[PDB]
């Protein structure tokens, strides 16, 4: 098939893609990346992410407030998210890019958690899965997911961590986003985790332009690199490549309803 991969997490509204959407989508397509899910980071970017999803067939969107942009989120940002969701753009498939991140001298962790729960409530209200960011916060994030029990669950994107942390998310019904992290065998033991998880729990992604793959550092990551992440995933798994490719597509469809 021409569309063999779905990058479930690409910040396509940021540079180098902004203003170069046509060429970027063709580079993605020729690599077999046929659809891309674009999660927002803050209310000020909702319009441009919605415009991408409405104007380009391959792009789908998620709206939400990223923990990395905590300083920009106000009660007005949350009201904007709710009103946007109420109008249901349609190619909007998740409440996303929400989560926790303990990086920094003062991550304002309590406020991050309150903000995450406000958005988890919206995902429940509008019956949508969530696209989650978690950096050094897997245990805490799992504690909140277990408590709030979202019927549509979601994906913990760009996962890097222990087998127990991954399995706990999978046991709560969440998927695991597989990106550039698996191309660095000496950076963590995430490759061993991904090699062991059930195939139905995996989604493919890049988190482009961030998370450059091994051997491509120093320049922006791009969605076509999902094809390369896939090649590495095949080296880790026992299943044949065609079975893995089909599973990632089916998993993505089951979670988001993106063909
Ligand atoms: Zn083909
Ligand atoms: Zn993230
Ligand atoms: Zn909570
Ligand atoms: Zn992201």
From Swiss-Prot:
Binds 2 divalent metal cations per subunit. InterPro entries: DNase_TatD-rel_CS (IPR018228), Metal_Hydrolase (IPR032466), TatD-like (IPR001130). Pfam families: TatD_DNase. CDD domains: TatD_DNAse. A divalent metal cation 2 binds at residues 97, 133, 157. One of its GO terms (cellular component) is cytosol. The keyword Transferase does not apply. It is an enzyme of class 3 (hydrolase). A divalent metal cation 1 binds at residues 9, 11, 97, 207. Keywords: Hydrolase, Metal-binding. The keyword Metal-binding applies. SUPFAM superfamilies: Metallo-dependent hydrolases. Its cofactor is a divalent metal cation. GO terms for molecular function: hydrolase activity, acting on ester bonds; metal ion binding. Its EC number is 3.1.-.-. NCBIfam families: PRK11449.1. Belongs to the metallo-dependent hydrolases superfamily. TatD-type hydrolase family. This is Uncharacterized metal-dependent hydrolase YjjV. It comes from Escherichia coli (strain K12). The gene is yjjV.
């Amino acid at each position: 098939m021409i569309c063999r991969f779905i990058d479930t997490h690409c910040h396509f509204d940021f540079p180098p893609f902004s203003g170069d959407e046509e060429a970027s989508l063709q580079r993605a397509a020729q690599a077999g990346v046929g659809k891309i899910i674009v999660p927002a980071t803050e209310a000020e970017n909702f319009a441009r992410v919605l415009a991408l999803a409405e104007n380009y067939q391959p792009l789908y969107a998620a709206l939400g407030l990223h923990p990395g942009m905590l300083e920009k989120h106000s009660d007005v940002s949350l009201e904007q998210l709710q009103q946007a969701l109420e109008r249901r753009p349609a190619k909007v498939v998740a409440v996303g890019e929400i989560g926790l991140d303990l990086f920094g001298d003062d991550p304002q962790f309590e406020r991050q958690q309150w903000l995450l729960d406000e958005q988890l409530k919206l995902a429940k209200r509008y019956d949508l899965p969530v696209i989650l960011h978690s950096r050094r916060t897997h245990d805490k994030l799992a504690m909140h997911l277990k408590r709030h029990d979202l019927p549509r669950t979601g994906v913990v994107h760009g996962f890097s961590g222990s087998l127990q942390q991954a399995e706990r998310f999978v046991q709560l019904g969440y998927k695991i986003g597989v990106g550039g992290t698996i191309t660095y065998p000496r950076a963590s033991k995430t490759r061993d985790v991904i090699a062991k998880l059930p195939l139905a729990s995996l989604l493919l992604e890049t988190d482009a332009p961030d998370m450059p793959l091994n051997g491509f550092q120093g320049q922006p990551n791009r969605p076509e690199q999902a094809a390369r992440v896939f090649a590495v995933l095949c080296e880790l798994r026992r299943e044949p490549a065609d079975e893995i490719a089909q599973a990632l597509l089916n998993n993505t469809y089951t979670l988001f309803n993106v063909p």
